[PDB]
Structures are given as C-alpha cells and as structure tokens.
Coordinates of C-alpha atoms and ligand atoms in Angstrom, one line a residue:
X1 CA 13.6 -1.8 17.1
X2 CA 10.7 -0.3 18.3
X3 CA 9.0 -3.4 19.3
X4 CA 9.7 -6.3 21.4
X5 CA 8.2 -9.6 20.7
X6 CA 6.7 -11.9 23.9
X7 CA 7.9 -15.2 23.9
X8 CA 4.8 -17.5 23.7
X9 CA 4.7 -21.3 23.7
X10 CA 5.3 -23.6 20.6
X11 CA 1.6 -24.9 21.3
X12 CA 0.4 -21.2 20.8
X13 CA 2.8 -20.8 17.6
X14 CA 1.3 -24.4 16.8
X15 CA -2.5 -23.0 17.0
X16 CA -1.4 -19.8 15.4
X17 CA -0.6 -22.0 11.8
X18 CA -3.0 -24.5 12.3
X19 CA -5.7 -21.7 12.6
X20 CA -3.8 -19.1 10.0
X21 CA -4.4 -22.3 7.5
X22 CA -8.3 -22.6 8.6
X23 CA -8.5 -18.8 7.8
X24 CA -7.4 -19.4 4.5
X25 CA -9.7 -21.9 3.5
X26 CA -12.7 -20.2 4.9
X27 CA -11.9 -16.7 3.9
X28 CA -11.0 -17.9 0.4
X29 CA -14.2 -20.8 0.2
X30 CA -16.7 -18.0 1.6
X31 CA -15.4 -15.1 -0.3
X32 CA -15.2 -13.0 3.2
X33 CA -11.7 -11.0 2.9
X34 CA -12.9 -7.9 2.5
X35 CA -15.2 -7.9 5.5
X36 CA -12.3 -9.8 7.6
X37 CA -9.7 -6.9 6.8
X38 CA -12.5 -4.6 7.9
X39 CA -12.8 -6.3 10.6
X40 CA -8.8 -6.6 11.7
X41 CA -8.5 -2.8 10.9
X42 CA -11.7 -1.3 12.9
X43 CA -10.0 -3.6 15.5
X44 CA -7.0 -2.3 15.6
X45 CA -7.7 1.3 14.5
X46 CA -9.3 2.5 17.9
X47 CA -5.9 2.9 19.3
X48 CA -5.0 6.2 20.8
X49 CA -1.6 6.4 21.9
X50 CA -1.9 9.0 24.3
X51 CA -4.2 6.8 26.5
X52 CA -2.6 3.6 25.5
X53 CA -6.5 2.8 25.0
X54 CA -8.0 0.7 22.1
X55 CA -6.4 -1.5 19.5
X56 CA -5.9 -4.7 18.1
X57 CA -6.7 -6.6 21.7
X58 CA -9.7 -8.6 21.0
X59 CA -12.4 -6.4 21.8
X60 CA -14.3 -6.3 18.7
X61 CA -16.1 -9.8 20.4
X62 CA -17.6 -7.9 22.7
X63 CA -21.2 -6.9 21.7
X64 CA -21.2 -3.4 22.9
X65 CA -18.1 -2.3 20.4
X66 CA -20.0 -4.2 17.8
X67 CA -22.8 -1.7 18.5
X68 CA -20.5 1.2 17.6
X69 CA -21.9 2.8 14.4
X70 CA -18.5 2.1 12.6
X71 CA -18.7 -1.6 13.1
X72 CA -22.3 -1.9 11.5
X73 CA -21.6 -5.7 9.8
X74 CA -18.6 -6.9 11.8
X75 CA -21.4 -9.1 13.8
X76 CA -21.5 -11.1 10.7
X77 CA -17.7 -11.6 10.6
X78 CA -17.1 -12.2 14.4
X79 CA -20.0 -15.0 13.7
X80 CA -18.7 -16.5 11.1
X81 CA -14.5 -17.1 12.4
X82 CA -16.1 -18.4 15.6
X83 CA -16.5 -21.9 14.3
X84 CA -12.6 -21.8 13.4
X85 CA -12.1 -20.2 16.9
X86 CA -14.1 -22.7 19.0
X87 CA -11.1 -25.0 17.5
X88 CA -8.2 -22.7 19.3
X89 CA -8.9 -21.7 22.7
X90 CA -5.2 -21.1 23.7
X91 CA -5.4 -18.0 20.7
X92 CA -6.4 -14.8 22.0
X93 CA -9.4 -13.3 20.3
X94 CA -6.9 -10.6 19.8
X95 CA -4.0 -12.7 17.9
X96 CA -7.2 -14.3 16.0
X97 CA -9.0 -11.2 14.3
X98 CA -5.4 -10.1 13.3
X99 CA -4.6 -13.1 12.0
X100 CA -7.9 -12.8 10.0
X101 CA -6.7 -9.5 8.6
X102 CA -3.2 -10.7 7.0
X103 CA -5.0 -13.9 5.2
X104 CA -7.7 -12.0 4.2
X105 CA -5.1 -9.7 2.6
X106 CA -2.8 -13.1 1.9
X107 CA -5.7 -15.3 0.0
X108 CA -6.7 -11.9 -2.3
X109 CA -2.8 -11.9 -3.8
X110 CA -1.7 -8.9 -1.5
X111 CA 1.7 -9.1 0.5
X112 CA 2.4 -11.3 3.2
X113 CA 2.4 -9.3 6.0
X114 CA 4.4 -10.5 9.0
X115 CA 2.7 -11.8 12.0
X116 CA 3.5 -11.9 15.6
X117 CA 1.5 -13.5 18.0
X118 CA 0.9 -12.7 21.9
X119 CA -1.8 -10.1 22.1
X120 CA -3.7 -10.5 25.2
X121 CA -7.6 -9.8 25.2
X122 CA -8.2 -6.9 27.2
X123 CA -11.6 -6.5 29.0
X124 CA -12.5 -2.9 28.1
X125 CA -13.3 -1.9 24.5
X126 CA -12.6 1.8 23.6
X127 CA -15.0 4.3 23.4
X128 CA -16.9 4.8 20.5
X129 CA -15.4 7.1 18.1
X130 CA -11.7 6.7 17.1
X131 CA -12.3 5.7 13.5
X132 CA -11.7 7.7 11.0
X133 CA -15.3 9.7 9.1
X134 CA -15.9 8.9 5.5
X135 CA -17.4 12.7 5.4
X136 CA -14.4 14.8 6.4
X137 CA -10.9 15.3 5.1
X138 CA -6.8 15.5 5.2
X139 CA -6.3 17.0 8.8
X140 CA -8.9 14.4 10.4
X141 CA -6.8 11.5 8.8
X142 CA -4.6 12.8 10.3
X143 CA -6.3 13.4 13.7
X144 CA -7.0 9.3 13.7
X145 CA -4.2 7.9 11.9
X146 CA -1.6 10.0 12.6
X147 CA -2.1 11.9 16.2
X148 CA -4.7 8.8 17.8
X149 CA -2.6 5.5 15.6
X150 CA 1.1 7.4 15.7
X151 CA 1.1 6.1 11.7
X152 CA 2.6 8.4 9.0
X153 CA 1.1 9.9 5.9
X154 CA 2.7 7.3 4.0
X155 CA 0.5 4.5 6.1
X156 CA -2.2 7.0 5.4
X157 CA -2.3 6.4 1.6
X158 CA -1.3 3.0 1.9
X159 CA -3.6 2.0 4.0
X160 CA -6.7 3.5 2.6
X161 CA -5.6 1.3 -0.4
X162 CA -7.6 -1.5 1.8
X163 CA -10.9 -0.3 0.2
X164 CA -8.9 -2.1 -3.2
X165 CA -10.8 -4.8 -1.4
X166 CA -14.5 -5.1 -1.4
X167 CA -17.3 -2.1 -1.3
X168 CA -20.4 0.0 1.2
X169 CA -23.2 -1.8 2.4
X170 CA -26.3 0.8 2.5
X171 CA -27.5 -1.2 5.8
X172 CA -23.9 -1.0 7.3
X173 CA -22.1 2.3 6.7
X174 CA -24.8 3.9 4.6
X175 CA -22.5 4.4 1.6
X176 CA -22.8 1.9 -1.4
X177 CA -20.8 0.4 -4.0
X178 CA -17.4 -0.8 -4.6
X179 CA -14.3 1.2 -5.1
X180 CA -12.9 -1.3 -7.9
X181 CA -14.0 -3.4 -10.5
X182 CA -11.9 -6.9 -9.2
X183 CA -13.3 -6.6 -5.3
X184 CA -12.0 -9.8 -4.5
X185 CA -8.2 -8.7 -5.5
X186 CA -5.8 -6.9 -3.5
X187 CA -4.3 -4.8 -6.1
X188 CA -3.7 -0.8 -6.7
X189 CA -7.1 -0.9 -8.8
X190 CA -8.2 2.1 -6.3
X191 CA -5.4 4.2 -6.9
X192 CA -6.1 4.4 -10.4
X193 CA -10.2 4.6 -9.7
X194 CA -9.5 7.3 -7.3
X195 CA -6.8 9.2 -10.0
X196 CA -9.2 8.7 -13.1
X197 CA -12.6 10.5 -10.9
X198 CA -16.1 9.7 -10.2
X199 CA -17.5 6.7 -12.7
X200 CA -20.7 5.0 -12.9
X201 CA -20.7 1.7 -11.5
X202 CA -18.0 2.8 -8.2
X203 CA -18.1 4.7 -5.1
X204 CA -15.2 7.0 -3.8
X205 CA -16.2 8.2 -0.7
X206 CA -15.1 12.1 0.4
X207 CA -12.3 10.4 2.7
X208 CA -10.6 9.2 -0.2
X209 CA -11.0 11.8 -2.1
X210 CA -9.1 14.2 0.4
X211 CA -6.2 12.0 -0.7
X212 CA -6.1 13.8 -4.2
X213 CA -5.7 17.2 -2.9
X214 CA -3.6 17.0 0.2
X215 CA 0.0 17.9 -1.4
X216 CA 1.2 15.4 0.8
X217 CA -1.3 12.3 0.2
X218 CA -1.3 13.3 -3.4
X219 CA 2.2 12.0 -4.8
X220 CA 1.6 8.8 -2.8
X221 CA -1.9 8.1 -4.7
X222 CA 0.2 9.1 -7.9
X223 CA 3.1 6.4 -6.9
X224 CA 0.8 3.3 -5.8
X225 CA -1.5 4.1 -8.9
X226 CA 1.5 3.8 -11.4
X227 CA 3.7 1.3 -9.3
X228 CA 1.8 -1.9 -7.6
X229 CA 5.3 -3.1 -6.6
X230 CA 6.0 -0.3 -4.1
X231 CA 1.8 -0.2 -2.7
X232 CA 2.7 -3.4 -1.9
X233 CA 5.6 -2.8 0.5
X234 CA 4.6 0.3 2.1
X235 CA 1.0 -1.3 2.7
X236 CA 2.9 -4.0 4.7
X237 CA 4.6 -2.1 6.5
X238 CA 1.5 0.1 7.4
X239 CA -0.8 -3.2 8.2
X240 CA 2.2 -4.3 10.1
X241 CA 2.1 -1.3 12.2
X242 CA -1.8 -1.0 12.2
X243 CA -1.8 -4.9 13.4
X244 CA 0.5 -4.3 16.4
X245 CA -0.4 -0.6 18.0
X246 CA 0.1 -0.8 21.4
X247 CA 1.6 -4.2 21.4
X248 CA 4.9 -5.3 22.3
X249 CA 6.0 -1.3 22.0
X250 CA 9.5 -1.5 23.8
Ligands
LIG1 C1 -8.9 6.1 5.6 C2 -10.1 6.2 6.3 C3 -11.2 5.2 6.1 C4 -12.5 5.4 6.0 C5 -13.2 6.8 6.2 C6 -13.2 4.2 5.8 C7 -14.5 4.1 5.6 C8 -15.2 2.9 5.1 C9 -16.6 2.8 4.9 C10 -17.6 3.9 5.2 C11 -16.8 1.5 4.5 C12 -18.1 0.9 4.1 C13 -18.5 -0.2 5.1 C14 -19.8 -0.8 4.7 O1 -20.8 -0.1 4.4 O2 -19.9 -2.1 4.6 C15 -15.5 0.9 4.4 C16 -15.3 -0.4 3.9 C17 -14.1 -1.1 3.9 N1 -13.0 -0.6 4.5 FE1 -12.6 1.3 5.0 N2 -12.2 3.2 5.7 C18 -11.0 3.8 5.9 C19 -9.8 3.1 6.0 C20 -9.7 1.7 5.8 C21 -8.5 1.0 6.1 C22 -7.3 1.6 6.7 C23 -8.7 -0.3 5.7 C24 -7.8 -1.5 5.8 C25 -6.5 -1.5 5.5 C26 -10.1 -0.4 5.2 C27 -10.7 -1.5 4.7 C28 -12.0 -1.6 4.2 C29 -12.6 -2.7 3.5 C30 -11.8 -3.9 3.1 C31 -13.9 -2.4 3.3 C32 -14.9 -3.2 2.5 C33 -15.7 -4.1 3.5 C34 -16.6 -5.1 2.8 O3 -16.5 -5.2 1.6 O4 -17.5 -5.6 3.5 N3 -10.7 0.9 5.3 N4 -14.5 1.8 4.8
LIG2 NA1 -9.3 -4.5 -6.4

C-alpha cells in the first residue's frame, strides 16, 4: 500500500507491450541484458529520498549523466534501445529504460518482475555521485541503498545478486571480469562464487565482498547461495522497489 498507481491510457499500456515484446527480441538477439539491467539500475539508483531527487525518471538520456564516471558504457545501451524507442513516442524514456531492466532480467530466466507504467521524464539528472563505490564496504551500502534508496538489507543482498548477470569492462568501470561462469543467466551463480572465494577466471569486487562479513548481509548470501527459489522472490521484490523509487509513493 505504499504506492499508488497513475492511470494512464490503454494506447500507453498498448506501447508499453508492443515495446516490452521489442525489448525481448533485441535484448535476447543482441545478447545485451546485462548492460540493460545496468543500465535500468544506475537509472534508478540515484534516488535520494530525502531530496526526492534522482531515480528511475528518464534521465540517463541525457548526455551529461552519461558522463558520470558510474555510467562509463550506458552510451552504448541508450544507443542501441533508441531504434526500439523511435517506435514509441507516447512512452516516457523513463517507463522505457525500466522496462529494459525487467526483460533484460525476464529473457536471462530471472523472475518476472511486475511492471507499472507512468513515469514522467524529468528535466534535471541528479548529481553525480549517488551510486554505490565498488571500493568500500557494509555501512556505505548502506549509506546508498539503504539511507539515499530507503531499500532494506534484504534488497541489499538481493540486489547485488544483479552482478549474476554479465562482468567489468577495464574501459568502463576499470574492474575486469565476470562474477560467474553462465553471464548470460540470471541465476544464484554469484552467491555461490562469492561463498566459495577468489578463483581464477572471476572477479569479486571489495563491494561484494563486504557482503560476507557484515553479520547482517552474511546469512542472506548463505540463503540465495543454497536456495535459488527464495533469490528469486526477494530479488523481485527489491527490483520492484528499485524500479519505482520515487514514483507513485502515496
Ligand atoms: C551493490 C553495489 C554495486 C556496486 C559497487 C556495483 C558496481 C559495479 C561495477 C564496478 C560494475 C562494472 C561495470 C563495467 O565495468 O562494465 C558493475 C557491473 C554490473 N552491475 Fe553492478 N554494482 C552494484 C550493484 C548492482 C545492482 C544493484 C545491480 C542490478 C540489480 C547491478 C548490476 C550490474 C550488472 C548486470 C553489471 C554487468 C554489466 C555488463 O555486463 O555490461 N549492480 N557493477
Ligand atoms: Na550467472
């Protein structure tokens, strides 16, 4: 009950599945979902609740957030859904890259995360900043995710079990390699990286890391690690969340 839904047109819920169904096929023909979850959560991550600034509301087109040191890359992905968007102008850019984010989690075998259309595009990106460091620990997860996002330390661990998908571009972030053997499945593969230590051949950055030692992140790694069934469901419900800060709050 914490949110409430705007009633948009049935030509808007019309583009919305016409374009959800153009996702799929591109992010599945062009092998793209990790980038577009990337994408959908750097998007949405900048919110800050206590401003009411940032979040999912389109602003990742605009070149100057693309310039933020975080989004090194996400050029590439805005570039290559705006042939799909060109097709929907009544969709905000908004609804669009968030859109991108559930298929891309959809067409890897994830869960099918819930989707709710009517973000408006708002003219002013956050500042540069609000995503979470790769370098530092438990209490600036918290920091981001939980004081910035309002998300708990359940959609902590869930959440970083994104990085199941895909891997660190040297050009991009600077970091390099793939968490998981199977980059192009959603599945708890990085738990069990993450809970079996460093190993040639994959990357586990000092971010996830802080999730094995926090007593409070640590039985969650343990749970998603032995139970895929139960990542599944309290991912949704953190990409939900992530997907929608600052929209439709009541
Ligand atoms: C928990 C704090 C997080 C940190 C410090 C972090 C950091 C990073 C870094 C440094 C990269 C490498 C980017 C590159 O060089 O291409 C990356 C990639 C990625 N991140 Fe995160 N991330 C975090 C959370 C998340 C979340 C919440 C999601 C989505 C649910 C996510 C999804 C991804 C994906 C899918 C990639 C791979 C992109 C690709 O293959 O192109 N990450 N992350
Ligand atoms: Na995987």
């Amino acid at each position: 009950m914490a949110k409430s839904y705007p009633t948009v047109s049935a030509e808007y819920s019309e583009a919305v599945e016409k374009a959800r169904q153009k996702l799929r096929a591109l992010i599945a023909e062009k092998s793209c979902a990790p980038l577009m979850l990337r994408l959908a959560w750097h998007s949405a991550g900048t919110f800050d609740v206590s401003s009411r600034t940032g979040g999912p509301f389109g602003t990742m087109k605009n070149p100057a957030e693309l310039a933020h040191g975080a989004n090194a890359g996400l050029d590439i992905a805005v570039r290559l859904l705006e042939p799909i968007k060109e097709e929907f102008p009544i969709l905000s850019y908004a609804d669009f890259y968030q859109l991108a984010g559930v298929v891309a989690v959809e067409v890897t075998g994830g869960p099918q995360i819930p989707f709710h259309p009517g973000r408006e595009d708002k003219p002013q990106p956050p500042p540069e900043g609000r995503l979470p460091d790769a370098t530092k620990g438990s209490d600036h997860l918290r920091q981001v995710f939980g004081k910035q996002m309002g998300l708990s330390d359940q959609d902590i661990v869930a959440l970083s079990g994104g990085h199941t998908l895909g891997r660190c571009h040297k050009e991009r972030s600077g970091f390099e390699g793939a968490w998981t053997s199977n980059p192009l499945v959603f599945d708890n593969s990085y738990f069990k990286e993450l809970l079996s230590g460093d190993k040639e051949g994959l990357l586990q950055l000092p971010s996830d890391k802080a999730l094995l030692s926090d007593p409070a992140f640590r039985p969650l790694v343990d749970k998603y690690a032995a139970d895929e069934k139960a990542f599944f469901e309290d991912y949704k419900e953190a990409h939900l969340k992530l997907s929608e800060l600052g929209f439709a709050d009541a």
